């Protein structure tokens, strides 16, 4: 069913990535899951070819602190600045990229994009808030951000540890700001993502857990009405947030639902969920003894 995910990257600032994510999440599900037997196997490099065409094009507009906006001369953002960084954590599977570039990016994101208290104010919102998934019209100003930064950073941990020894601080105090101020949230989206980052720091043990655990509607979804992309994405956040405590109880429910929705990636805007949909379906089969 999944034949509609290798897509042509394009667009000035991020559409290349918009096309790079369905071109990078396929080779990440398909590979780890040993599903390279129906097609014939002559395309695998075609994607890496496709990837070396877009990520490279994504570098046509580097910024001096290795920062990333859609636009160079502009004061650059932080969602595309760190999210293309996270689209690369799946690239390391096959593509050959260098590593000093991200540590030269993070040095700025801690020197000029974190407050003494663990806040992360996106000092440049973007013009494309449809690529961002469920980050548009929530009230919770910078909780969802402070953890979305933390997960982007911690995805490529044990990578920028040599070149930049500042990073572990930004991770810790951001997650501290989370744990002391994670319980007092209302929505499940913010519940889901920040649970996972404390799970990344191993710190998701306690009532902070209960709220996140609680919020499960029928134990197989984090229910909100904003968009299914918000729910399906945060379900894939909690699922990754679940594999990290090695739970094998609450996982099949999710799996069941996540395998009756019959979502296989696709559509304008369907950018965040696409990534998460199969990133978590893939790490699942990596842990689950089959």
């Amino acid at each position: 069913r999944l034949k509609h995910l290798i897509v042509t990257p394009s667009g000035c600032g991020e559409q290349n990535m918009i096309g790079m994510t369905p071109t990078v999440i396929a080779v990440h599900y398909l590979d780890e899951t040993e599903q390279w037997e129906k097609f014939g196997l002559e395309k695998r490099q075609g994607a890496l070819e496709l990837i070396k065409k877009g990520y490279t094009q994504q570098l046509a507009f580097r910024q001096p602190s290795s920062a990333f906006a859609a636009f160079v001369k502009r004061a650059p953002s932080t969602w595309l600045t760190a999210y293309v960084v996270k689209v690369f954590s799946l690239a390391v599977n096959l593509i050959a990229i260098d590593s000093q570039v991200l540590c030269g990016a993070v040095k700025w994101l801690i020197l000029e994009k974190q407050k003494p208290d663990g806040v992360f104010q996106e000092d440049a919102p973007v013009i494309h808030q449809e690529m961002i998934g469920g980050l548009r019209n929530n009230n919770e100003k910078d909780m969802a951000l402070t953890a979305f930064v933390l997960i982007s950073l911690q995805e490529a941990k044990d990578i920028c540890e040599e070149q930049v020894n500042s990073l572990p601080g930004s991770i810790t105090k951001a997650g501290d700001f989370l744990e002391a101020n994670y319980m007092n949230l209302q929505r499940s989206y913010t519940v889901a993502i920040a649970g996972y980052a404390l799970a990344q720091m191993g710190r998701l043990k306690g009532p902070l857990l209960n709220k996140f655990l609680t919020t499960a509607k029928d134990k197989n979804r984090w229910e909100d009405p904003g968009k299914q992309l918000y729910n399906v994405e945060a379900t894939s956040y909690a699922l990754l947030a679940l594999l990290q405590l090695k739970d094998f109880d609450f996982v099949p429910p999710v799996v069941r639902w996540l395998n009756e929705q019959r979502y296989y990636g696709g559509g304008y805007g369907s950018t965040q969920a696409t990534f998460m949909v199969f990133q978590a379906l893939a790490q699942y089969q990596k842990d689950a003894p089959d």
């Binding site: 029928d218 134990k219 197989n220 739970d247 094998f248 109880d249 609450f250 996982v251 099949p252 429910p253 003894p289």
Partner: protein
């Protein structure tokens, strides 16, 4: 000819509904063909939370199993087995719930062998089950024998000997095995 049998069934999310389907069709068939010597039955479904579906009285008033068992549904939580153990013997195996003086106490734990999230450990709830004399069979399900800790948690639930106490779910022999184990009692 005195006999009180309890059921401590896992209802955690690690139980797939077919396992749960198969639990209900299994626990029933034990009942239907075993109206013997006034054998008394109690069940409780356990998970993160717990549900006494019937005590002995609620059971004594209605003997029709198929009517009893069809509606039972799943809880989809974690696996608090040991905390479900002490609650059975303290609540289901209380006379206040129908337990008869001088009856043989047997508990049939239907679980998948993965204790999880129980604030109580296993070391608390077994030697009390010994000091209080419940015969503890374990009916392990799904993938319970594939790995190591899952089958070992089972022999830690069952009493000794395990060759007469630990059984597989699919085998329809365990009931005949208690049937003959009572038949000679």
């Amino acid at each position: 000819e005195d006999s009180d049998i309890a059921f401590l069934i896992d209802g955690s999310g690690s139980i797939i509904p077919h396992d749960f389907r198969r639990m209900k069709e299994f626990v029933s068939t034990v009942m239907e063909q075993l109206k013997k010597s006034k054998t008394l039955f109690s069940l409780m479904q356990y998970s993160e939370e717990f549900r006494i579906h019937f005590t002995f009285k609620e059971f004594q008033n209605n003997p029709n199993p198929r009517s009893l068992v069809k509606p039972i549904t799943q809880l989809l939580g974690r696996t608090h087995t040991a905390t479900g153990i002490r609650k059975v013997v303290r609540e289901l195996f209380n006379i206040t719930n129908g337990a008869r003086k001088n009856a043989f106490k047997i508990l049939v734990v239907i679980t998948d062998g993965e204790k999880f999230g129980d604030p109580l450990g296993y070391e608390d709830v077994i030697p009390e089950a010994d000091r209080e004399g419940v015969i503890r069979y374990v009916i392990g399900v799904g993938d319970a024998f594939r790995s190591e800790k899952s089958r070992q948690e089972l022999n830690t639930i069952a009493s000794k000997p395990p060759r007469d106490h630990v059984f597989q779910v699919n085998n329809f022999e365990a009931l005949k095995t208690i049937q003959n184990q009572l038949r000679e009692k």
